[PDB]
Structure 1
């Protein structure tokens, strides 16, 4: 009852896998990148019993990495053929074994090269410490593995043969092709990339931090407090399991950002993907449903099937930045909306049916039919996305631009003042060094409603919906129950934002005024 695993970590350097060189084979090496798949954890044969078919004699001492079949001695030397054995499945050791696929870091790909991938394999208690879709660091052994598909490549291939000298008068010539791939074998993993509570407490005790967060959730963007609130609130959840029936709810919040081009609306998506650890970014034209939703690899490499970490299965528990949303097709937006009519996702091919978990927020950037925002149209007409996918958005933010010289000189200054090297023009009140960790304290807070709030909230939906009587002035879309449901799950976001366990209606009035601000004029 004994096996060991040993790791060396914190090596002095990181080698980008483009600079893998065969001069290092069998050496220790430091690697990092993006994990693109994992695989089913499997037994590796390690030490196993092998039994002769000719007599009850057995051997347990093993040859195991390759060549795993043929020990050279039988504990009685005489056999009618000594060399060959059968295994046993009963008396064997085994160790847990896993393959994961790692991809080159998009920050350091060569010009015009593609993001190189290579195969990296795990043994023992290091298994199940990789996670798809995120930065990882490794240390371990520069292994090499036989590869057949290199047949048809240029250059000579080295072929081995057994010699013919000094044996006489006794592929029958004995020949083999030894052509190899360079996988990696990793012994250590970490998910790269005290006085903290004395800061977390220190901020929540202060009265302003919400307004500091609103003007620091995207420091470089000028004005646009509306969207800043929206995104800050979008990083915060609402109780999804809030039912008695045993069916869950869309506790998370969805947002769309809209306006004429040359709005900085696209910058937010870069800031978010630069900042929110469970975030990813898509151009939304260059996409397919089979890349947002997980693909499958069809039972290849002798294992069973494996599931491919689609971009919208990833960004569980967070934000997907779908830039230029409207240039998606009918196919993948319906794939989305079937993944919003249910939190779940379902997949079928080859008869293998899988239902994935999902729970996600979408941040969508969209553009009018002509780019220019038609003030005189409803958002349904202007935006041109069908009503079901225009539903299930808690808010739309809309931006319209024109010359306002008092601002334009301050904006122009803000752009040009930015082009002085790393200057403080975008200095927030406080930085990410506490903001992310404070958000995690806010997440695990899980706050609750109050009697006076709910009794008052029921009247503000009357107040809201009454504005559609005498409607179609300062009103541009229908108001229905989903706006009450939107208003509920914003109540937890501010309650999380303030770290207040049991909300008061004077805070929910700020979410109500955000729903108001979101509405728009129309011509009478």
Structure 2
């Protein structure tokens, strides 16, 4: 036995039992831990949230140091201590109704170490790692406690808990056996733990110069499974564990080995991470999540006389001189109402914008600004991307193994804006591929034994230079683009950006740019910060604007005028797709003004946007 382990276990029990602290100004001195024991008993939960600072304040941090430095050995001792604490206080929830496997998920650790910063000395210790979720596995049952049936002296014996390696009971229900031939498991009596292996990439910001993003495989168990999202930045807290590796046998350098009749085992390992706490880095739900400070900010923000213009000027601070493009990007960010018909048709409810313009017109700047600002957004370039990248892909589970689905760019931008930079240079096959998904919002993979139907409700923001690298004055927009007229028809807004030799605008833009290089910040101050914008967009998204009966007429005559005006030759011909687009923009405008009913002003704004977007030859 180990004296230190038992002593630390009982010290942990005592510290938990006598934990004390003042609770704010109200609640007096509240034993937060002991009271939260019954708080989680109310729902009979399985997690006990051990904030690190609590464990750190006591015993001058010696208990925290012992737990962090040698967590793997202490964890069963802490489990026994927690069971004893439940026995002494609040024993009403111990039974599952065998015994619930309570999870001790630490958090609020001092520092978070990157994937590149993982070290071989700190294995067996507790830390936090931050990375991007790229591949996740199924929720496969994992054998934790097993029931074994002895081939000899046959019977059923449970409570033979499973270790990391297979374990079978040496003692038998009939002791005369003492033989372990074919100890057989059974479904109804064995105990299992939920399991999930999530692959994480190194974050882009922390990538070393001239290096590839190092990856890692993270194990999820208990109630923490199925929490991460592919393409969602998340932090993982737990212990570094080693797992057997059969690949690194031909690598240079000597190898660990054993001798016991050769009695030799080839010993290689690769480092993984077992995680306990993972977090992601109705309008009433969003309102409930909203704090009152913001709720009231929102109230004066909502009751502003001119909220549309102030929202427009608050988007894309870096770019100067483009207002209609800012309006379009704002509408795309807000989105639209996804409506389903009784006959099965799923009406499109997101805005797709193709921005064409002369070189050096902040188009790439718009796309870069949108990403990193719009939640669940992906930025890609035209040439360095493929269909397996834009759409979902198929790749092996592990090297020399079966294949699996790979998260594509479109899905990583599901219910988000995907920014496709340099659309024209991107290959025609991948063009068919992106457009095919855009038509039905669903990307299907039918290769290598997988026929999953993968949906992607993504608004596409496309940028492309005119053919020849310069807009032809004579030719139209369709004549200066390499995509087809149906591709024009699918896309909603065409913001053809042009360059002109106007002295005033040149002087003002030069002043703006040299000031932006001058004042690293405060060069231009948008009325609304990122947080306020994000929240407003989130709140507006929750509302679902409804079309009033009166505005339907105004739509009808506006579409009549739109059909009459052209070809009485323009960039895009007038079709019904346009009338759908008129609503698609109207719902976004209504969401912007935080209104619930469509008014003729909204149709006026949408028709203004569509009449300005169309360009005379």
| TM bucket normalised to smaller | over 0.9
Relative to structure 1, the CA distance from residue 82 to residue 496 in structure 2 (aligned partners, 3 Å threshold; closer, same or farther) is closer
1-structure distance, mates of 2:148, 2:180: 13
Partner residue in 1 for 2:590: 495
Q: Does 1:454 align with 2:552?
A: yes
Q: Does 1:468 align with 2:557?
A: no
**Correspondence list, 1:156-305, <5 A:** 156-162=254-260, 172-192=261-281, 194-298=292-396
* 2:149–2:182 CA contact under 8 A, matched in 1: no
Q: Which segments of 5 or more consecutive residues in structure 1 lack a partner in the other structure? A: 163-171
2-structure distance, mates of 1:84, 1:240: 58
Give secondary structure in 2 for the equivalent of 1:6. strand
Relative to structure 1, the CA distance from residue 61 to residue 455 in structure 2 (aligned partners, 3 Å threshold; closer, same or farther) is same
1-structure distance, mates of 2:100, 2:206: 42
2-structure distance, mates of 1:113, 1:303: 26
* 2:168–2:180 CA contact under 8 A, matched in 1: no
Tell me which moved more, 49-58 or 198-207: 49-58
Relative to structure 1, the CA distance from residue 301 to residue 374 in structure 2 (aligned partners, 3 Å threshold; closer, same or farther) is closer
After superposition, the C-alpha distances for 1:83-138 in whole angstroms (9 at most, x for unaligned) are: 66333333111111111000001001111110000100100001111111011011
* 1:491–1:508 CA contact under 8 A, matched in 2: yes
* 2:172–2:178 CA contact under 8 A, matched in 1: no
Give secondary structure in 2 for the equivalent of 1:334. helix
Tell me which moved more, 318-327 or 343-352: 343-352
1-structure distance, mates of 2:562, 2:165: 75
Relative to structure 1, the CA distance from residue 302 to residue 403 in structure 2 (aligned partners, 3 Å threshold; closer, same or farther) is closer
After superposition, the C-alpha distances for 1:231-264 in whole angstroms (9 at most, x for unaligned) are: 0000122222242323211121110111110111
Tell me which moved more, 16-25 or 74-83: 74-83
Relative to structure 1, the CA distance from residue 173 to residue 421 in structure 2 (aligned partners, 3 Å threshold; closer, same or farther) is same
1-structure distance, mates of 2:402, 2:223: 23
* 2:403–2:448 CA contact under 8 A, matched in 1: no
* 1:71–1:83 CA contact under 8 A, matched in 2: no
* 2:160–2:168 CA contact under 8 A, matched in 1: no
CA drift of 1:58 comes to 4.2
CA drift of 1:302 comes to 11
* 1:377–1:476 CA contact under 8 A, matched in 2: no
After superposition, the C-alpha distances for 1:45-100 in whole angstroms (9 at most, x for unaligned) are: 10011111011244433352333133333344433845663333331111111110
Superposed CA RMSD in Å reads 2.0
* 1:69–1:87 CA contact under 8 A, matched in 2: no
CA drift of 1:37 comes to 0.9
Partner residue in 2 for 1:168: none
CA drift of 1:183 comes to 0.5
* 1:46–1:62 CA contact under 8 A, matched in 2: no
CA drift of 1:300 comes to 5.4
Give secondary structure in 1 for the equivalent of 2:407. coil
Q: Which of the pair has the greater relative contact order for Cα pairs under 8 Å at 6+ separation?
A: 1
Give secondary structure in 2 for the equivalent of 1:200. helix
Partner residue in 1 for 2:580: 485
CA drift of 1:405 comes to 0.9
* 2:392–2:443 CA contact under 8 A, matched in 1: no
2-structure distance, mates of 1:351, 1:146: 28
Give secondary structure in 1 for the equivalent of 2:230. coil
* 1:62–1:68 CA contact under 8 A, matched in 2: no
* 2:355–2:363 CA contact under 8 A, matched in 1: yes
After superposition, the C-alpha distances for 1:130-157 in whole angstroms (9 at most, x for unaligned) are: 1110110111011110001001011111
Q: TM-score, normalised by structure 1?
A: 0.93
1-structure distance, mates of 2:196, 2:576: 48
After superposition, the C-alpha distances for 1:202-258 in whole angstroms (9 at most, x for unaligned) are: 111111111011111111110100100000000122222242323211121110111
Partner residue in 1 for 2:533: 435
CA drift of 1:460 comes to 1.1
Q: TM-score, normalised by structure 2?
A: 0.80
CA drift of 1:476 comes to 3.3
**Correspondence list, 1:37-436, <5 A:** 37-79=135-177, 81-82=179-180, 85-162=183-260, 172-192=261-281, 194-298=292-396, 306-436=404-534
Give secondary structure in 1 for the equivalent of 2:507. helix
2-structure distance, mates of 1:157, 1:301: 21
2-structure distance, mates of 1:469, 1:368: 23
CA drift of 1:401 comes to 0.8
Give secondary structure in 2 for the equivalent of 1:83. coil
* 1:35–1:132 CA contact under 8 A, matched in 2: yes
Tell me which moved more, 48-57 or 236-245: 236-245
Partner residue in 2 for 1:30: 128
* 2:135–2:406 CA contact under 8 A, matched in 1: yes
CA drift of 1:354 comes to 1.5
Relative to structure 1, the CA distance from residue 344 to residue 508 in structure 2 (aligned partners, 3 Å threshold; closer, same or farther) is same
Q: Which segments of 5 or more consecutive residues in structure 2 lack a partner in the other structure? A: 1-98, 282-290
* 2:169–2:180 CA contact under 8 A, matched in 1: no
2-structure distance, mates of 1:159, 1:364: 56
Relative to structure 1, the CA distance from residue 456 to residue 59 in structure 2 (aligned partners, 3 Å threshold; closer, same or farther) is same
Partner residue in 1 for 2:112: 14
Tell me which moved more, 179-188 or 373-382: 373-382
